[PDB]
Amino acid sequence: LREELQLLQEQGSYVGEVVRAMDKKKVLVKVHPEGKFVVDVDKNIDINDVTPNCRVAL
Amino acid sequence: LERIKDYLLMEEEFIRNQEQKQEEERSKVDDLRGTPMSVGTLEEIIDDNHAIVSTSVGSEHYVSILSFVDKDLLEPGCSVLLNHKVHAVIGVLMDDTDPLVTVMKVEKAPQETYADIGGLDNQIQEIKESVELPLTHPEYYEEMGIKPPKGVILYGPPGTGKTLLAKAVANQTSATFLRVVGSELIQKYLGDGPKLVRELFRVAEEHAPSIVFIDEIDAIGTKRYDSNSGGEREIQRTMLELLNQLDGFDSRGDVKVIMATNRIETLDPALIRPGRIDRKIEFPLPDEKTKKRIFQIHTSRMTLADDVTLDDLIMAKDDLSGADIKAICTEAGLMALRERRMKVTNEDFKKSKENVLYK
Amino acid sequence: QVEDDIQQLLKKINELTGIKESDTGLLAADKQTL
Amino acid sequence: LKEIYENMAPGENKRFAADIISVLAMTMSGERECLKYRLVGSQEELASWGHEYVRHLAGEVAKEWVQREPLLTLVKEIVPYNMAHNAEHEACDLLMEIEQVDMLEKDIDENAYAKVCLYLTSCVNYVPEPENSALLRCALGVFRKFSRFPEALRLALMLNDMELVEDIFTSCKDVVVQKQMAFMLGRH
Ligand SMILES: Nc1ncnc2c1ncn2[C@@H]1O[C@H](COP(=O)(O)OP(=O)(O)O)[C@@H](O)[C@H]1O
Known part of the structure; x- marks a missing residue:
């Protein structure tokens, strides 16, 4: 388990502020310092289970 | 048969309609873009399917559209789909549900009725006839070379029924009902009486034929709110704004106009004049019928x-309007609910009359 | 209705038609330029 | 009274008996003899209001309904049931099937106008197994508002044809009304 600790190195995670979801499949979002991005979701979540005003690991 | x-x-x-290579091409159209892309705002434009954009972080790149969707679908100063590479325009966007149209855009029914x-x-x-008519049966004016009654004005004391009318119409209406109050037409930020008017009118023009309604247009004058600036050399413009928007150039179109004031002595003639506001309607304070x-x-x-x-009450007050009468109706309700009584009595209305009117 | 009848079927022809060569031919204005 | 009923191919005369005995069979509470008169009602209740009889027994055959006068006449209550309405479209299509060169001459020689005969037309020549004209000479006759100008020109257009060239000729009598008809006949 402590061997995959290199994982921490993989990269980082971007919290984000969802502006709202739409059609075509891709959540519309404004991260934080930067601004709005419309971007795909994780496969493990719906588009529908995604509401407006909520944090999510990008 | x-x-x-x-x-x-x-x-x-x-x-055949539902019946609407390509998959790759569609994927080519997906592949072309980037996952994920980048929001960014329009600035200028050029026939080169590219102009300079605008960003919060304010990189402004020259970039093409990924072209099936269009540049003319959009205007300068508008957020567009950009890659993260060059911020390449990847397509248009949809001006998300703003917070203007909502507020100003009464959807659900207005209640009441033209037989209330x-x-x-x-x-x-x-x-x-002047407004609801040309909206439903508009087929006569098309022969008498007349048009509709531009704007309409409602005035009179407090309780003559001016808001009912605005409420009655909306009950059986069929056009977007924009309910904007002038009192709201007075914010605490210089040069903001002309944004509100433009947004309300601009929102009205977009939703196509609609009823712009302004209850208490008087409040735009007969009032000087602390938190404001300029005092009254600002409200004036805001009037001027209203007067100009509610009036000339361009070609307003199907924005009908409904103003609800109690005192018509405090309206700028520019708003009353016809063109801007033609039909001038009064709301008398009942009587006996x-x-x-x-x-x-x-x-x-x-x-x-x-x-x-009901007579006793009618002949009771001196010049009670259509409100006071309603208050007495309701008063009994609470009386009724008070001493726990399904049906009301005489005093209940009496206490009401003396509880509302008098007091 | 007869004229109206002719109207419907006529329109259905293209509808029927359009689907045909649609099947047959199955980006570059831009995807090239892109 | 079943005897005078034995010959059932009448265009009309079989009607009243097939209404009376059938209503005599309808108030009698029966679904047998009643239908036999419904095929053979070439009018049952046309002017008079129809009971449960017409609605049920017409259509029962109506969907069953080259040709059987039983079927043919059953709907000669129906197409008139649609003509008593003067509006519009249903048993005409029933008639388009019928390929009877009597009825199409025989049905509406009178009555309807405007839009109404305009859509009778496309049914007249085109739709039946054969091609027909008669109404467009026949009901055509009276053509009050210009016999025929009003409706026939609505007919003279459409069917990008020319058969309606006389139709305008016949009514259009002014040189200059005909000059327009002339071009109208010319435009075909
Ligand atoms: N004659 C009447 N018929 C129906 N409702 C009335 C009548 N008089 C008063 N009301 C009620 O009282 C309220 C008075 O509002 P309104 O007529 O707009 O007065 P103001 O213009 O002073 O605001 C309305 O909402 C209406 O429902």
């Missing part, structure tokens, strides 16, 4: 003691 042939025809049309306003008529036919319809209407939808006589 041909109806069947007609129906299946309609059906076959549905199939006891004691009116000529006032009614005047408004309806209208009130009967008003009283009967307000006490007819409840367990009103069939003993008492």
